[PDB]
From a paper:
In acrylate metabolism and detoxification, AcuH is functional in both the AcuN-AcuK pathway and the PrpE-AcuI pathway. It can catalyze acryloyl-CoA hydration in the AcuN-AcuK pathway and the branching of the PrpE-AcuI pathway. Conserved domain analysis suggests that RdAcuH belongs to the crotonase superfamily (1.07e-74) and is predicted as an enoyl-CoA hydratase (6.64e-150). The activity assay results showed that RdAcuH has acryloyl-CoA hydratase activity and can catalyze acryloyl-CoA to 3-HP-CoA.
With the enoyl-CoA hydratase from R. norvegicus as a model, the structure of RdAcuH was solved at the resolution of 1.9 Å. The overall structure of RdAcuH is a dimer of trimers in an asymmetric unit of the crystal, in which three monomers associate end to end to form a tight trimer, and two trimers associate back to back to form a dimmer. There are few strong interactions between these two trimers. Thus, the dimer should result from crystal packing. Each RdAcuH subunit contains two domains, an N-terminal domain (NTD) and a C-terminal domain (CTD). The NTD adopts a typical spiral crotonase fold which is organized by two perpendicular β-sheets. There are three active centers in each trimer and each active center is located between the NTD of a subunit and the CTD of the neighboring subunit. Because RdAcuH and the enoyl-CoA hydratase from R. norvegicus have high similarity in their sequences and structures, we found that the corresponding residues of these two glutamates in RdAcuH are Glu112 and Glu132 according to the sequence and structure alignment. Biochemical analysis showed that mutations on each of the glutamates to alanine resulted in the inactivation of RdAcuH. Like the enoyl-CoA hydratase from R. norvegicus, there should be a water molecule in the position of the acetic acid molecule that acts as a catalytic water, and the carboxylates of Glu112 and Glu132 are expected to be ionized under a neutral condition.
Author numbering:
A (entry chain C), B (entry chain B), F (entry chain D): 3 to 65, 77 to 235
C (entry chain A): 3 to 235
D (entry chain E), E (entry chain F): 3 to 65, 80 to 235
């Protein structure tokens, strides 16, 4: 790989974005390699949890069209992974970088994390879920504000609003995340995949139907 | 009843879970008696609000299958109650106990409350809404984390994330809760049932349709 | 206008509710003028962002009881009480910021939630006390509150009528920003000017895409968003 | 039961509405006893398929407390399959009961309709919902607004019923279908019914996922 | 009006599209006048049912600013019922207008289609949405992709229309239906139409709750 | 390919199922080759419309599971194709073969066509959309009947119920289908993809939202 680093240590695959010259901004090559790295991790029977991270400075600072379906296949590639993916976010996670963090299953971030959707500054909009996942996760006011004004959201507000699960000091981010990934790697792999799928039903079906789906999956784990 | 205590005063039915040796864990008998007590309260024209609580130590610490539809009819019994149900949560509300609290209309909890969904530790998953209600109420990151790692959530995080409405000191929990229940009992019973049903549409229909439902129900109160 | 004031400056239409004797309670006249003013702002190519505010004491302290009294079911159903007014606000394609100070209660809380986002002062108090009158929220208080802040707090507010202060509103996601009372309008007009600096097509597209979040499954919302993103080319 | 007859043979429960002098109009007693007999059939390990029918003249010709709520919910919660064998009139609540069943076999004399509008009310047990989803907006709007009847051949052509047979073959056709269903795996049959019913509650993409997960669990 | 004719008689408003030289094709002015006439009929306490029709030759043969949005919203907001009486061509915009009405009665000369693909665009007023939901994926996909026509017999067989009658009976059949609707409670008629239209917006379980609550309020 | 034949002529890719001794039953090899042929047709800028057909006798007469997601990847490969696919059905289209015909964008069939879902006879159910697409396309009674009893549906009933668009004599099936495919090949490729995508929204979103999506796609075709 030329834009990412992949390390497999004791059932956890760690994928580190590696474009320091561009503060880990997404591009065609990085997105292509990331999806490949994720697909290899999914097919690797030893991998039980995935972690995506960037640098202390930036998780990822930013990033015809209809026939090529720009941004479609990459989003699909990540969403198809059945194993869990934790985003470990330090510093900037902006634009596509914020959207990548929200596509992961949950976020653990450092107290320096800064989130934002500044696409409007370029005359376009979020194109990988910034108008959709942000709103569902943190509520209309904050998502509308962020998407319309481009304002940033700090780690404390991110935790307070439900964008992230845990905030820890920058020096403890990787320790917190790998401990969580290890703990997930201790669980039944079938149950882990079922949990992820059931949780993700929450944004696709009426609650009454999501309860039925959950109960049938629960019963099948017997 | 053998596993619960029921007291009706001033239009409030207080249902207390009473399995102290199991820390109020939900079993067949308790769920069966709980549903019966709720149905009696629904059919009791003197009851205007229901409260469910456990002990100071635990609200509730935890909880063939296809043909018997394990956990289906119990959940449906609780969800069909039209009168409002407040959960007064002290100490542990884990697994099925967390799920019961989330099935109530809102939660008031003490500062000692601890929530969690540790079903994954047994190779199964939440089977009474833990993957559905938790996600919809507090957002993807915290619900994914809780369901995948089994981590607990303390009272302060529960209020900050929207899982509970109010947190009060341990010694004020029942005073705070009963005063809320008595405020509800002062209101029109028809309007209270309409309120609860309208709010619950929020997780079943698109917003445009929920707005139409609310307005038609509002009009019917004339 | 009799009950509101409209001032356009730097591509921002500021609409100020002006029934101070009544703490800016909504009534038939105010709602009619408000919707007219929003439609004018929508058709005004000078306007790129809208701001609604009340007084320092009250954004809007409720809805006038006379809007509902003296009416039968046939009246309110055949007339579709509160339907046209809500639809008139929701159809506006330009963004609307609510600058909330003091009381935003009942219909006034619902108005703030129909806006695209809220900036409030640290004196703001929100609530849905309709249940105190034997009725319920009729302009989205049972729907938007629940979806934005979660079931527990919405159920509690709609059933008990309890208030929510500015700090809890921000912590629960009801509002985007809380500032001191002295900076409320400066914070809000600066955000509105920032929005007015952007492409008007992209701004309307952002607002429409965000609002899909409450109408379609996420998978379909993602498809809609990507097709609109692509159409901006 | 005073108003219904229940007969169990070859793992099929035949439930006959027994108010023929009222053309099997659904009153409080019939509806209560119908739900009770359905619940008994569900809890009866010998029953694997259910059939509901009325008389040759009428399947069922018309009809805080949540009026009509509990009855509809009681029918909808039955997990075993229910076939409606419809002869003659199926009107109002009777048409709605037929549509609540999993599918309809009807005789060529069957007549469907929703004439609730004639009384100043509307369908209150699914006539505005199931009819529209099953046969399309034009015919459902027309039936609900004008009260017009739909005959057996139009019912099959529009998808309201699955099969039309001569009046003298109705029970033979239906009991043969029901007996065949009752020979199948009970778990798979309940799974089939549940998956099919997802079609009206979830987006197709999600219904596909549900169906595939249920299919897999049958392993 | 310059593009339409409006006649009110015996509680029925008849709106006739009148662009003979364009075979009643929809344009800015016609849609503007149609919405205005519909809104006047909504506000006219004398009108209880609306009918839209064109000529014997054509119902309607075709068609930042949100092109085609506000007019569609204006038609969809009408609470009183609207019957489309379709003779001859109902194509493109004209097929979409007919589907936006509450139900269709058509002559045996009616011809439906969505030929927008021929111009390098697509249906823009519901032809990809209502057609599919009313008649099924296969025929809607075929019609929208190939531009093929659908005759009156196929329209009734597939559920696109409620009734097909001879050309000379179209207006009599339609005005009789409109008169029957005008005999009913206006509150119940508005409720019925709104309940039926829930069928395409909510899960069935929720549509049933909505219907039951509106039914109960009609007391 | 070993189980299918693929021929591109005049912007139409004809894919013929070719397991005649098995009456074109779907197996792992055929589904793998079919998906490959579809993806190649999608990436082939000369292809504007796809046709799938079998033999005169049968289109297709029939055909660990959770971790491998049995039948998921195959269904998803067919559904992601953006160009249109016509099913030309003669003779038997049963089980997985009926489901394959329903996954295509529309069906033209001969008067000898026979459809059915006999999975229930094996103790399983439809696992590739037979419980979902059949019901949505032709109504609850006929779908419930077919799925519970395994009864066949003949060509006339298929057209009458909306399962197929057109029925023609056996000798005219391929002529009718290729002429339809040529008509589609004459159209704008971007508008053809938009039509198919807009039509398919009909089964995923509320009608009001599908109208919004349709109008925005219509506008962008400018």
């Amino acid at each position: 790989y030329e834009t990412i680093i992949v390390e497999v240590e004791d059932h956890v695959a760690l994928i580190t974005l590696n474009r320091p010259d561009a503060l880990n901004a997404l591009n065609d090559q990085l997105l292509s390699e990331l999806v490949k790295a994720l697909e290899d991790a999914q097919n690797n029977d030893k991998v039980r949890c995935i972690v995506i991270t960037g640098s202390e400075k930036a998780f990822a600072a930013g990033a015809d069209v209809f026939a090529g379906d720009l941004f479609g296949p990459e989003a699909e590639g990540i969403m198809r992974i059945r194993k869990p993916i934790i985003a470990a976010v330090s510093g900037y996670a902006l634009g596509g970088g914020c959207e990548l963090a929200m596509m992961c299953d949950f976020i653990i971030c450092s107290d320096t994390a800064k989130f934002g959707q500044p696409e409007i500054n370029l005359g376009v909009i979020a194109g990988m879920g910034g108008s959709q996942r942000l709103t569902r996760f943190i509520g209309k006011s904050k998502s509308m504000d962020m998407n319309l004004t481009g304002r940033f959201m700090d780690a404390e507000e991110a935790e307070r609003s439900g964008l992230v699960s845990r905030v820890v000091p920058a020096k403890k981010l990787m320790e917190e995340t790998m401990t969580a990934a290890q703990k997930i790697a201790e669980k039944s792999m079938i149950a882990v995949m079922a949990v992820k799928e059931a949780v993700n039903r929450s944004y696709e079906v009426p609650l009454r139907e999501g309860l039925l789906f959950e109960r049938r999956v629960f019963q099948s784990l017997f």
